[PDB]
Design a protein around this ligand. Structure first.
Ligand SMILES: CCCCCCCCCCCCCCCCCC(=O)OC[C@H](COP(=O)([O-])OCC[N+](C)(C)C)OC(=O)CCCCCCCCCCCCCCCCC
Ligand SMILES: CCCCCCCCCCCCCCCCCC(=O)OC[C@H](COP(=O)([O-])OCC[N+](C)(C)C)OC(=O)CCCCCCCCCCCCCCCCC
Ligand SMILES: CCCCCCCCCCCCCCCCCC(=O)OC[C@H](COP(=O)([O-])OCC[N+](C)(C)C)OC(=O)CCCCCCCCCCCCCCCCC
Ligand SMILES: CCCCCCCCCCCCCCCCCC(=O)OC[C@H](COP(=O)(O)OCCN)OC(=O)CCCCCCCCCCCCCCCCC
Ligand SMILES: CCCCCCCCCCCCO[C@@H]1O[C@H](CO)[C@@H](O[C@H]2O[C@H](CO)[C@@H](O)[C@H](O)[C@H]2O)[C@H](O)[C@H]1O
Ligand SMILES: C/C=C(/C)[C@H](O)[C@H](C)/C=C(C)/C=C/C/C(C)=C/Cc1[nH]c(OC)c(OC)c(=O)c1C
Ligand code: SF4
Ligand code: SF4
Ligand code: SF4
Lengths: 156, 114, 78, 178, 115
């Protein structure tokens, strides 16, 4: 119907604004965070996609888990994630974050950040190259593009 | 059977340090519960303190009681200075863990373990 | 030094304290033998007196206050 | 041999010529103007950015990326289930089972790489005596679920057939260094 | 009247954007989201406790100098007087004792923050 069509284009409108402004939380754990700094470096310039690092979880949209999550740091990662306003997305980057990686069998490591927070995109690698992370970030925008919140509200 | 003492020269001089640690842990439950905004009562917290002290009720070697007291002071300090979090304090209460039955039949129905 | 304002209170708390049975409680009932408490129950009781009379009791002292009287006697000895 | 980075106290005398230079430095912010100049020069340099995803960063033929199982030119699998990639894997990322095939060949019935344990070290590539397991040049294979990153044999053979045209040329460009 | 209108219009815009911000988004409130921020760990104490002011002496010296601005701000009208010699002499002295007061505090380590 006309209203169902209008709701669709309003859905694209709000998605587009969230796709075009992803503000990751300044937050990296280990060597994977070095490649996340390279994605911010001139060659890739994530800023040109509208991606701006913000220190405060209140001002951040995306949490990129870029390094190993140990048991000591697990509660703190969850707390800054809880304090992220919604909508909010997690990119798990690297083997350590993806599933433990080189430390999977360590007594002190969380075997994957997805035991602690819900993860949207998994980026393989140890570390993923800055392009691999960039591909993952741009794969998160397409996930948002497929969001259908307003349309589903209409059919409730 | 002769050995260097750590601090106490025999069990009685070591129980003195135990009761002094139990006092400190007892005085701190109402603060931990208040500052950490735990969702328990003081009586329930203090009972848990007593439960942990009775977990080691069979120890008799005085050197061992010295190192349990040493550890317990470290645990007390981690709590008074709020280096621990709700998650850490609440781990003593095993609230998510179903407890394994202690009767033969229930174990027998549940798997191969003794 | 006021020896029955003390008696009213030193036994007041012992009534509130749980694992003591009020009816069996007597101003000269041994904590370990009669009432049947544990060394860590006494530590709780002695601290209760600290709540009222508001003056620390060194552990060396408190390891003898085995029935309500000595308490009463000890504080009178303040 | 050593040098002094921040030693210079071979004190000279403050001439009126030199004192007036120190003052102009302080009052006129001259060194702060020099810094403004350096960032102005950068404004008129060409940016180093590349137009991703339409432009890609350079890579070499050795690049360690996504895994793949290769074949012989006849289409037979190279892997003979020797399990050396499994014995070397620093991350215990590879799981293998084998048995005699229907024709009697020594072949794997299972071959997994948990790509979330893998550290992409390439050691399995070195250990393989028949170039069966390789790390291809793919690096753009991020998924939306953890479970999609647990590769079984079918998935790895499919990556082998998908990427063979490019894998074969990278080995051709590099095997003489090995 | 204009100056009252333009500022209500400014206030209504700031209000209107405030209302849209709170009633438009989809809100999901729970305790762990609405706790205070402190770099990932629980705060060890409320933020309402005393916060020592290491520049307090400069703070109250700002007040004294702030009122000495109130005495120099009439000058644009004061240079319109016939008694130019008087206006100027009073102005020079006023600025000079502000300077002499500033020099004394500077030499007394008054501008230094308390450690
Ligand atoms: C506030 C002002 C709103 C005006 C901007 C809204 C339009 C957003 C679309 C746009 O500008 O770019 C085209 C975008 C660009 O597409 P894109 O975002 O998928 O492409 C990005 C990737 N590259 C760079 C490779 C192209 O088109 C869209 O896909 C979104 C269209 C949604 C339009 C909103 C619905 C109509 C409004 C009702
Ligand atoms: C600058 C202003 C930008 C706004 C541009 C117009 C777009 C407005 C779209 C609504 C804003 C997004 C709110 C939202 O995401 O929640 C969706 C909500 C959620 O839908 P829901 O009701 O199905 O969700 C139920 C709650 N959960 C899912 C958690 C169980 O949908 C709406 O009700 C929005 C109604 C849109 C009508 C426009 C006016 C709204 C005020
Ligand atoms: C611009 C935003 C103005 C339109 C949305 C106002 C929200 C609202 O008050 O809903 C009516 C309210 C409900 O408020 P509400 O709590 O659902 O507001 C949330 C807005 N959405 C749905 C988009 C997330 O209706 C009532 O029940 C009381 C009136
Ligand atoms: C006829 C009669 C003539 C009467 C008039 C005579 C006038 C003479 C000219 C005086 C000019 C006064 C300008 C103010 C200069 C000044 O105060 O700068 C000094 C200040 C102190 O810096 P400091 O680290 O302390 O080094 C010196 C040690 N005291 O250092 C600084 O100020 C640095 C501040 C820099 C902050 C960054 C600002 C950006 C600068 C670039 C923007 C340029 C536009
Ligand atoms: C304790 C703090 C003291 C430190 C500060 C001391 C400040 C002293 C300032 C002295 C300067 C006064 O300077 C004085 O200016 C006046 C007027 O401006 C001049 O006066 C001249 O101009 C005025 C009008 O402008 C004529 O009407 C007058 O007949 C003529 O003499 C004087 O010739 C000059 O000497
Ligand atoms: C300011 C805004 C920006 C956009 C900046 O350009 C970039 C992108 C942000 C930076 C620099 C850091 C982002 C996240 C973060 C907190 C990383 C952890 C880290 N940071 C380090 O140093 C800074 C290290 O140093 C050895 C590390 O080991 C580690 C593990
Ligand atoms: S996955 Fe590799 S690069 Fe990333 S944090 Fe772990 S060890 Fe470092
Ligand atoms: S690259 Fe290294 S970690 Fe990954 S499967 Fe091969 S040997 Fe194992
Ligand atoms: S991939 Fe290579 S090293 Fe691994 S089992 Fe097969 S033949 Fe052996």
């Amino acid at each position: 119907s006309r209203a169902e069509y209008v709701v669709t284009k309003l859905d694209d409108l709000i998605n587009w604004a969230r796709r075009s402004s992803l503000w990751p939380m300044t937050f990296g754990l280990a060597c994977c965070a070095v490649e996340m700094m390279h994605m911010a470096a001139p060659r890739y310039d994530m800023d040109r996609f509208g991606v701006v690092f913000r220190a405060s979880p209140r001002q951040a949209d995306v949490m990129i888990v870029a390094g190993t999550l140990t048991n000591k740091m697990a509660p703190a990662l969850r707390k800054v994630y809880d304090q992220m306003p919604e909508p909010r997305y997690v990119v798990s980057m690297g083997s350590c974050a993806n599933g433990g990686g080189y430390y999977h069998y360590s007594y002190s490591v969380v075997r994957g950040c997805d035991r602690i927070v819900p993860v949207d995109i998994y980026v393989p690698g140890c570390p993923p190259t800055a392009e691999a992370l960039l591909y993952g970030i741009l794969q998160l925008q397409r996930k948002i593009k497929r969001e259908q919140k307003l349309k589903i509200w209409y059919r409730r | 059977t002769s050995v260097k003492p750590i601090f106490s020269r025999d069990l009685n001089e070591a129980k003195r340090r135990v009761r002094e640690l139990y006092r400190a842990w007892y005085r701190e439950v109402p603060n931990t519960v208040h500052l950490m905004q735990l969702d328990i009562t003081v009586k329930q917290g203090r009972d848990k303190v007593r439960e942990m002290f009775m977990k080691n009720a069979h120890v008799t070697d005085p050197r061992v009681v010295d190192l349990l007291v040493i550890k317990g002071k470290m645990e007390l300090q981690e709590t008074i200075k709020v280096w621990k979090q709700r998650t850490h304090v609440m781990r003593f209460f095993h609230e998510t863990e179903t407890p394994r039955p202690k009767d033969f039949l229930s174990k027998f129905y549940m798997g191969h373990d003794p | 030094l006021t020896l029955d304002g003390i008696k009213d209170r030193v036994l007041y708390v012992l009534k509130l304290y749980d694992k003591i049975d009020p009816e069996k409680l007597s101003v000269n009932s041994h904590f370990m033998k009669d009432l049947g408490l544990d060394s860590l129950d006494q530590v709780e009781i002695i601290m209760a007196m600290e709540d009222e009379f508001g003056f620390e009791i060194p552990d060396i002292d408190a390891e003898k206050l085995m029935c309500p009287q000595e308490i009463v006697d000890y504080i009178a000895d303040k | 041999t050593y040098k002094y980075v921040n030693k210079k106290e071979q004190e000279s005398e403050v001439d009126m010529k030199s004192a007036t230079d120190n003052a102009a430095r302080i009052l006129m912010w001259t060194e702060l103007i020099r810094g403004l100049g350096m960032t102005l020069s950068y404004l008129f340099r060409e940016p180093a950015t590349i137009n991703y995803p339409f432009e890609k960063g350079p890579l070499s033929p050795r690049f360690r990326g996504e895994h793949a199982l290769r074949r012989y030119p006849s289409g037979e699998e190279r892997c003979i289930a020797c399990k050396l990639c499994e014995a070397i894997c620093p991350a215990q990322a590879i799981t293998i089972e084998a048995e005699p095939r229907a024709d009697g060949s020594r072949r794997t019935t299972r071959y997994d790489i948990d790509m979330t344990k893998c550290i992409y070290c390439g050691f399995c590539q070195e250990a393989c005596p028949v170039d069966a397991i390789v790390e291809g040049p793919n690096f753009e294979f991020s998924t939306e679920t953890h479970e999609e990153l647990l590769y079984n044999k079918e998935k790895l053979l499919n990556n082998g057939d998908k990427w063979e045209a490019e894998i074969a040329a990278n080995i051709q460009a590099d095997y003489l260094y090995r | 009247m204009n100056l009252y209108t333009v500022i209500f219009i400014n206030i209504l815009l700031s209000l209107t954007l405030i209302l849209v911000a709170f009633w438009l988004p989809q809100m999901n409130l729970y305790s762990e989201k609405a706790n205070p921020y402190e770099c990932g760990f629980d705060p060890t104490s409320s933020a309402r406790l005393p916060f020592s002011m290491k520049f307090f002496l400069v703070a109250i010296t700002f007040l004294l100098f702030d009122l000495e601005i109130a005495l120099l701000l009439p000058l644009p009208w004061a240079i319109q007087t016939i008694k130019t010699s008087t206006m100027m002499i009073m102005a020079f002295i006023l600025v000079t004792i502000l300077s002499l007061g500033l020099a004394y505090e500077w030499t007394q380590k008054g501008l230094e923050w308390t450690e």
